[PDB]
């Protein structure tokens, strides 16, 4: 679960999770997950070679500047950092598509300068103090897996660079039994956050796609929400409590009331602020007793539409289990090509589900939604569906990078939406990314699935992949690009948010100030302005 | 349920509630309510004389110009062309020159306020509050708003010094629900809509919000937004951050709004935040999105007695760990326990003063929703209590003191006839403070009494009445007899203040609902940190560049 300083000594450096964890061929034809890492790996997929070729029509460095008396000083305090071009590299991209294309196939433009790793709140201190008197620019890093464009330092940004990794600061500082909080250091990723509660009966929860790298840090800064948000809250749920080193001093509330009223919440101030106002050191978030009991289940649908229907009539009677999605026909089919060994099926959808807590509950709970999806034409579909419907938001980032090798580009995006947009919103924007690929001179139709993944009482997050062979076509990341911004567009004029979860970045700066309006804006930038006057913190995010 | 403009006709002017409803004594000498609102209406309560005797030792026998309005000229001339509704008149001006804590009141008493609105506006509409606000750019004027006039914080007291045109922009015209949508289940209303009125016209589609502080029947969605309200459903329905899904705000910079109407969003920091709690700092609050529930099949009462206050906390405790907290559940101390018995209709004998009783602790409970839910959690709630030494008291319990919850501000008013000052206040704290917090608090309450010479003890009792996963709100109720008193008013105040001390110190929060106007303003920075303190200030000077809201809550 810690992340080591040298990073490329287990992970790829030009891809997505472990080095020992790629998809190849086994001695059968089939494709097989490398190493020992997952459920999945070592699991041969007879069906997946069949359904990539079928689905697509395919076979099968900048010197480092830094100040030389800051440097001297930085020696004194004793925190470990690097000038190697290797780290830099490293942390000068999250994982959108964009930034690694540019890693496999060129460079970037601007890098971190040097790599900073404090272990403690007071080393993020002495940095930020470092970086006034000195004039420094910081981004700071956890997890790496931005997928906003929220790591990239920006072309014109002349000032030395300082990424401050956050890896080393990851220790579980008290678990207060008697109150069910975690009191945390911002730098433990999801992963040995949940190991180490754990080994002393409790958990958070908290569960990401990208848990295993993404931090409590990273988590606050960009808004993150976990597949049991339905249990557990998402991170503004979670929260209770925060430290934060900014230019202009620390962040932090007096008391540990679960729930006050003494002003606008300053804790929202920092949530979303995606590494534009300091650095979180520290983090109190509420935990829970381990779940006793696990169950996987599924549902198919007749389409689309009554399946929606049915999520929502779930969300209505407030008994979402702990995760259910809903998938559309070509992601259910998607999904199934990932077995180990009527209905119109052009429309079939098939919801899946996820249920925790005590064994009789649970029973008595797969029994009611059942029932509930049983007057939309849904039937039990089974648990192996279940199972592996979300291992296909788990090793997703995985297929990328096969995908890649076969000239094949594919991303994910997401949405919220009021529960009466979603149907339309979802076939209006898969069809205008099908359209737009046609008229871009993509010979193939695209790869254009959607899933619903979150119920809320006022609505859904809809989430969205896009992938299409760029066989004879020359240009294939710009033409990718363009694609996606008329699916965001596409998404607005459906009445969907801008992001629900991924957050603004720099990838969606420009529809920010429609989407919180221009005094909205103003207000974030007044913030902005008071508490990093200089623009240390100068990733320009957001704004 | 609409306020009408001229408010004193129908409401106290000097006091709580409706003109129709106050204690008095009746022909058999027994304290009753006038009028027929509330289900104690026209109820003869015969024991509660001698509670209030035991209790504050008074046998019940002693009972107990205007500024100018300063206007512009063209200003006003301006304002006639808008056609919004206005008055210079005094009443109106004084009625908007305070909320409810304890000495607003005695000052409407006894005295008159150092400062008052100087002309009051009725806007019906959005476009008139940005009219409004254009006008008072252009004039160098001041605004206030207000909506039920309910602030427990000195929310709505013009500042002494201010020396502009102030403007008590009222709300209570503005109250319309815009649309309700049945597919999203939320409900667009506007700001000045009553928590009372606003589930009556819910009701009619089948709908409610669910949202109930105390103070429903006149506090309203933009006060409740600009405070932070709690409801005491809140286990079902959300407090209001939980409850609200857009809005709409006019501030001198301009409007702000979010485009889209998502359930949950990533696009930086949430600026539905910067503008709960504001207080009336910054704009006024036009619009809003609220979830609705269908409303609920069925509703049942029920009440737990305990061996003492100590394992009465633990329970809960334990019911807030299995997250199955009832829609309402509150634990009241003894004193409470002995003061809701009171309030019985049986008559006792003048020759007349296995748990005991005066350790005893009483948990009420409300459950709400689809019968059969509501009676398999009913029953999986007392299973728990049960563990605790709990005993179902009955539903009768029950129902009495969820109905006591709108009569005890009438209440107050009685107190301040016969002589005695009284008023409540809330903290949040860590499930691990709460029994330390209430001991200490209510005991530093005592201690100070004392040593400001009041003679008899004070009233000083407490309730859990919400819990969460991390904590529990708790309620405090303080008053005393100020009879032979120098300085009642600087008595009381110092002895809530150091009350209010005594909470920090034990692990508590400023507010947890009632929020910080001017009241508790030298608490905030610390409460917040410099920095904290300092990025409000920042939103502030950004979107009030001079100032206009200047009721100087908060900062
Ligand atoms: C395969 C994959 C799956 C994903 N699944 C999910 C998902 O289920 N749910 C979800 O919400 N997101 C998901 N994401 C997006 C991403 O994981 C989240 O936004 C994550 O929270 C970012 O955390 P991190 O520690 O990697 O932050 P980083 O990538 O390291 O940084 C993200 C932003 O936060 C700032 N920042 C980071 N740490 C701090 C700090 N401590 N103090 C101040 N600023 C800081 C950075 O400067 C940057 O702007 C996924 C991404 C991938 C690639
Ligand atoms: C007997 C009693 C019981 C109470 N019980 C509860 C309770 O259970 N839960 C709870 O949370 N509170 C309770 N309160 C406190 C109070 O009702 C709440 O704080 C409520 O939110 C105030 O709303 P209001 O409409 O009366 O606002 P007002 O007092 O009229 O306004 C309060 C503040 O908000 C501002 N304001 C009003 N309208 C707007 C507008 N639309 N835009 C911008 N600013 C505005 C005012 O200028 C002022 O600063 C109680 C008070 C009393 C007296
Ligand atoms: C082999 C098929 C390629 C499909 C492309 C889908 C890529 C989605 C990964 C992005 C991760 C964000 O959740």
Redesign the interface.
Known sequence: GIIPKKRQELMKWNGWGYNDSKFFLNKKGQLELTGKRYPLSGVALPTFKDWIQNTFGINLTPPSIVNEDFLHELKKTNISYSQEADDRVFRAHGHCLHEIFLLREGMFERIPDIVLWPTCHDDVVKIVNLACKYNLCIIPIGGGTSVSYGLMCPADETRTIISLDTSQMNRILWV?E????AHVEAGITGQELERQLKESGYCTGHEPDSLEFSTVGGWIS????GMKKNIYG?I?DLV?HMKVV?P???????????????????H???????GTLGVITEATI?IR?TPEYQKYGSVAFPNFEQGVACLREIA?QRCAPASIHLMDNQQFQFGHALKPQGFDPNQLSVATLLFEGDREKVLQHEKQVYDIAAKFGGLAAGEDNGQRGYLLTYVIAYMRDLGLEYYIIGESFE??????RVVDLCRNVKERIRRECKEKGVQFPPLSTCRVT?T??????IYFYFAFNYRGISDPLAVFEQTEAAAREEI?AN??????????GKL?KQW?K???????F??????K???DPTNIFGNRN?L
């Open positions: 207060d008697n109150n069910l909080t960009t808004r993150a929400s998402n503004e209770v900014t202009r001093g620390v962040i932090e509330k007096s008391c540990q009331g679960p729930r006050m009223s003494t002003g606008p919440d300053i929202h101030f920092i949530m979303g602020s995606e509420k007793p209505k949405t919220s939406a009021p529960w009466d979150q809320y009482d006022a609505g859904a997050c607005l009445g969907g948010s801008l992001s629900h979860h991924h957050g603004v969606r920010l429609e989407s919180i309006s221009d005094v909205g103003g207000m974030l930038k007044s913030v302005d008071y508490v957001l």
